[PDB]
Design an enzyme around this catalytic site. Structure first.
Site: not given
Ligand SMILES: [Ca+2]
Ligand SMILES: [Cu+2]
Ligand SMILES: [Ca+2]
Ligand SMILES: [Ca+2]
Ligand SMILES: [Ca+2]
Ligand SMILES: [Cu+2]
Lengths: 718, 720
Positions: B364, B378, B461, B519, B521, B667, B684
């Site tokens: 956010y 999440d 959500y 915020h 996503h 690497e 959003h």
């Molecule tokens: Ca690596």
């Molecule tokens: Cu949203």
């Protein structure tokens, strides 16, 4: 009595027999019928229908009254289509009107013998009157008028005719303007090339045995300030050739470095350009499945047993909270007009007119057979005219309704396009969902109404979807498939000497075949009237700002909001990270926010994206077509400005479209604005795209932004 | 032996359709399409006849079936959607028995402490090589089935590995400084603690709340601010944001702004109460379930497949057209797509060893007390697999879908079956290709896509993930976002109120006294692609405008400068949709001499503004701890231990243990086993249309075969 099977499948209806239930299921567009042999009644869209003569089974062959189809399908139980008692002022010209308009100009002393018709379209009442009809049912109290644009040999003349009073209002020759390519022009080209000894000779060099197997293609030559050695006065066309080897795909057998310039007035080849000799790619490459066997697949049907949620009255479409008018145009195709959203009993303006503005497909190869390829499909070839009838069940889902549309051909004769447009409702995942933990779930399904139109020009097949979401959102997608324009090269694999040079401007997609790189640029003209005529262009740029409120955070997420007051400023690149709105500074939602619509020129695509025009600013194609370099445009409403590429794009010396429309940098503050969205792709070929191109899509979007006061799909309050 | 048909079938989860005119019943349940007439001694299953000893009975307008009807018909065999797996796939998720077995082993362990919870109990990955050999050569793995047991002893993380085949404890390793993810009981604790807190109750009473029992809490992770937040790195903490329950079934619409409580889960108490300006709680009823709405009448629409499906489900293996893959479930990241091959005219070609969600973040932008710390991981912190939301038949998925159940272990070590955890469905996707040559017969074929859909709900959500297998070789991965918005209580009712400007500096005023705080996503996908083999290389193709040196009127040309991306640091980049990035196999070519490849597209569109990167200044911590946020494309060498973009233990992390770490050694990515990570997201900025409930917003990603084949993939079998 007639055999049911023959009669029905001859009617375009689908027939299904269920031996277990001894039941026939008949489907055609909005009609979903069920009938049992020997039964005194039938079922049409959930409604019982008394039958004069029951269905009769003989030798286990169904038989029906010769009045069956009319009695059942045109019974009235199928309410998909409704009668239009008061014709919408935007209805396209009827077959009769087309014939009437042609008569009127032919009666004029000025009408020259052999004159052709580039376009015969409706000259619409003014915008204000049309809205009043759609919103207040107020008659336009006007006479049906038509714009009749003709091609006298190579000369363009614009006439206006008054259909009611059946009189010619004006006859205006258009100086310096080149006409678009007409059907007959395709035949002349082939014939002229066929009768040219020189050309047959050039063809002979390049290894071609039978010059009769040579297939020509008529291409616009553009404009190079004289660099191409072609005079501006002459009606010209360049000819690219292919060798027909009987595989049904002459596109797979290019005759590289052989270009002919044909003068359609002199009916002769006025210039043959010859480059290095490249053997013709011979290997057969059919794309129609003649050499294939599709794998067996289980059936899938999308059924609507009780009919459709939408009704089609004339050309007026009604669906849930949506209401709009759908018509056809020979040049740009489908036109979505007088679009409103019924907000709880009140129809609010969304879009007066929306349609394809125009499109362009330019190539990146400098060689003689390619440096000039910049196809203006709609403006130079007529996409509406070249509409490709929908292949039921394939080009559109099995639950679609296919509409026929009428336009005028180049000789002024009415022309009805069967299955020109597809209308269908579809499931689009969950509209919204919330599974509160330990609580009963909340889910509603999303429904979209799609208006699909396919046009095919030469080797390309374009698909256009106008998508109406129940929640007020409108999507516009453009799919592209067909056959790639290839170049003959000497290398068979990337391990050959010439492979490096041969693939400098395109990928080696087959032996001796390079799919030359190019772009697909689509422009959409959207006369949006956000809850009214007077709107303004507002920008909202999400930005990161240092934190001044205290606490551990050094930065915050904020928005730089500001108005875009004029056309020059409105013409810009689109950053999908930002927000662009067309607001109504005179109306607000319940929270005091001006009702608006979010404009999204780029919402995705399956091919690399076109950031702009893959052309140096000094290229003539670049000069002529400004709309190619900007994804967003906004101009003041003007009925005469409708094409991004300009009215007469053939061999144009400068920008007569958007470059010209915005040229005066007028004010866009609280006034009638027109939004133009340019979206495109950069196409770098693959083997997976040969001999036929898997459909590639691009997405655009128009979202209501504070236009409503809450989730639009929750429903009315008890 | 008779039961009321309608009730029994509804209860069983089957769709029941009665046709009065045809006196016919149509029953639908997953891959089974059934037709049955009252009194008839025969029924039809997927086009096949099934004898019924006891017919369906129509008694006084009421249908009746035998107590055995459902079993005889639905589990007859005529429905061939699901087949029995002969030889167990090495990647099969742990069974309920294995789960319980793994729990016994560690519980019988000397050091096992009572009350030890289980953050994750999952199969330990057999040798990738052995797994492919099995999938491609049906060669048995031959290494004991192992399980990773991650437990939380209070606030301490211990990693145990059990050998299921031999019932042995292989290793018990305490993990220093690591915090455990949020567990289900933590939610209950937070509410009880707030309920028993004298002071907190006092804090809410002064903010207008008369009944403290109506206060609903939410358990949020606090992150890490180098002590700046005033929270000791040692303690197991969670911040608490509260809402007032007004009875509209939507407490999210009634925030108690400027009131935050810090709960020490180990001490079982509020160790800190942050109070800000008192803002009157938004009280108006804002139900999203329709209780106050009129249910409009809509005409029915059904997607049917009368003779069954085109795909077969054997155990967890899915066969469809030329596609073959393994589908399993993980408590943390959810669905896992493994051993994905494409049958090329008899030859199964490798495409992806395993793919799945890597991890995600929802940061956010509000600096205030109740927001500054909100940067949700999440899957890592809440476990999305565990939080899987059962698919609502016909709504969350089309009516022609097959709903799969999935089993995982709950936080107490007990087997847990998620009903309708995943949805599988074939769908019409416009024409695959088309060409209407003028004057010629049309050439058109329809496009078919196999969709694997999974839904996970974390708090407010609701996330939807679609794994889209195109018949032509293409693979799409879409993420959809919906649910209820996290809002901020504000004083202004409209933008005309004195405090409006300040109230909306960090979000849009989407309702009276309600602001949908801005915020983002940000989703990340871990895709271990094996483009026709293990050893691949990263190649760049930049479409460029080069000046014309070949002659003619043209001043410029369209060319492509191609080049390899040698290593990890270089592969970690922003993605320009105008360019082309390929994961090629330098050891294999198509018929034209071109390296078989797959095109990687982290950004293929979206319905919300697109996230250009993390909306954080570079001096922020959330930005530090997590680097996967800024780049859209990453390529690292294969490592069975590197699976999370944000790191294995992201809760209160002090440094980057994810992608920043995985590529840290820079690497080489030349002709070796590569792993592609795609990052995509949205920014959003709320609007009224998204309240009280948010319309699903989508973002798309794409994986396209690039010269992997020699021609149009779907042309069909050659009769020549
Ligand atoms: Ca690596
Ligand atoms: Cu949203
Ligand atoms: Ca203007
Ligand atoms: Ca307007
Ligand atoms: Ca790999
Ligand atoms: Cu193309």
């Amino acid at each position: 009595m007639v055999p049911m099977d023959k009669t029905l499948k001859e009617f375009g209806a689908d027939v299904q027999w269920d031996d277990y239930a001894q039941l026939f299921t008949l489907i055609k567009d909005g009609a979903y019928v069920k009938v049992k042999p020997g039964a005194q009644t039938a079922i049409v869209n959930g409604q019982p229908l008394a039958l004069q003569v029951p269905v009769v089974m003989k030798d286990n062959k169904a038989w029906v009254s010769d009045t069956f189809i009319n009695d059942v399908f045109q019974s009235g139980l199928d309410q998909t289509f409704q009668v239009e008692k008061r014709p919408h002022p935007l209805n396209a010209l009827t077959a009769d009107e087309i014939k009437q308009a042609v008569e009127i100009v032919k009666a004029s002393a000025d009408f020259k013998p052999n004159t052709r018709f580039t376009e015969i379209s409706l000259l619409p009442p003014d915008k204000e009157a049309v809205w009043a009809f759609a919103l207040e049912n107020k008659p336009v109290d006007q006479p049906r008028k038509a714009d009749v644009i003709m091609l006298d040999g190579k000369h363009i003349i614009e006439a206006v005719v008054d259909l009611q009073n059946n009189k010619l209002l004006s006859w205006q020759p258009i100086k310096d303007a080149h006409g678009m390519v007409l059907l007959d022009d395709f035949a002349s080209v082939q014939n002229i090339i066929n009768n040219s000894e020189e050309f047959a000779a050039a063809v002979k060099k390049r290894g071609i045995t039978d010059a009769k197997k040579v297939i020509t293609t008529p291409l616009t030559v553009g404009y190079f300030d004289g660099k191409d050695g072609l005079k501006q006065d002459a009606r010209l066309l360049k000819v690219i050739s292919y060798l027909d080897v009987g595989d049904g795909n002459y596109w797979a057998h290019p005759i590289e470095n052989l270009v002919a310039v044909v003068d359609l007035e002199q009916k002769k080849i006025v210039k043959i350009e010859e480059g290095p000799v490249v053997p013709v790619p011979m290997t057969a490459r059919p794309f129609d499945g003649r050499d294939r066997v599709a794998p067996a697949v289980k059936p899938m049907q999308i059924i609507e047993p009780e009919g459709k949620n939408y009704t089609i009255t004339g050309d007026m479409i009604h669906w849930r909270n949506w209401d709009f008018h759908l018509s056809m145009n020979s040049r740009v195709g489908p036109m979505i007009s007088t679009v409103t959203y019924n907000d709880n009993g009140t129809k609010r303006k969304v879009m007066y007119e929306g349609s394809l503005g125009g499109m362009i497909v330019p190539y990146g190869d400098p060689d003689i057979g390619w440096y000039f390829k910049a196809y203006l499909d709609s403006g130079d070839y007529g996409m509406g005219t070249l509409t490709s009838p929908i292949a039921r069940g394939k080009d559109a889902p099995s639950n679609a309704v296919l509409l026929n549309e009428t336009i005028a051909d180049y000789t002024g004769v009415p022309m009805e396009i069967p299955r020109a447009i597809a209308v269908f409702e579809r499931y689009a995942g969950p509209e919204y969902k919330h599974q509160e933990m330990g609580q009963p779930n909340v889910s509603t399904e999303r429904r979209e109404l799609v208006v699909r139109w396919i046009s095919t020009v030469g080797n390309y097949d374009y698909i256009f979807d106008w998508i109406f979401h129940e929640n007020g959102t409108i999507g516009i997608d453009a799919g592209a498939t067909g056959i790639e324009a290839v170049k003959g090269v000497k290398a068979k694999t990337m391990h050959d000497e010439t492979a490096k040079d041969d693939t400098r401007y395109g990928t080696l997609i087959d032996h001796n075949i390079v799919g030359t790189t190019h772009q697909h640029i689509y422009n959409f003209r959207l006369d949006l009237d956000v809850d009214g005529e007077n709107n303004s262009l507002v920008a909202m740029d999400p930005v990161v700002k240092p934190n001044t409120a205290g606490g551990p955070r050094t930065s915050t997420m904020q928005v730089n909001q500001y108005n875009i007051g004029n056309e020059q400023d409105a013409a810009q690149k689109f950053d999908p990270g930002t927000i662009r709105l067309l607001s109504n500074p005179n109306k607000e939602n319940r929270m005091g926010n001006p009702v608006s619509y979010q404009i999204i020129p780029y919402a995705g695509g399956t091919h690399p994206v076109a950031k702009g025009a893959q052309f140096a600013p000094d290229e003539w194609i670049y000069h002529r077509l400004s709309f190619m370099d900007k994804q967003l445009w906004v101009t003041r409403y003007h009925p005469g400005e409708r094409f991004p590429e300009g009215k007469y794009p053939n061999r144009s010396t400068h920008d007569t479209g958007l470059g010209q429309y915005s040229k005066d940098n007028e004010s866009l503050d609280n006034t009638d604005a027109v939004v133009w969205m340019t979206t495109g792709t950069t196409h770098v070929a693959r083997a997976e795209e040969w001999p036929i191109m898997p459909t590639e899509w691009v997405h655009t979007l128009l979202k209501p932004w504070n236009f409503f006061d809450e989730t639009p799909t929750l429903g009315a309050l008890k």
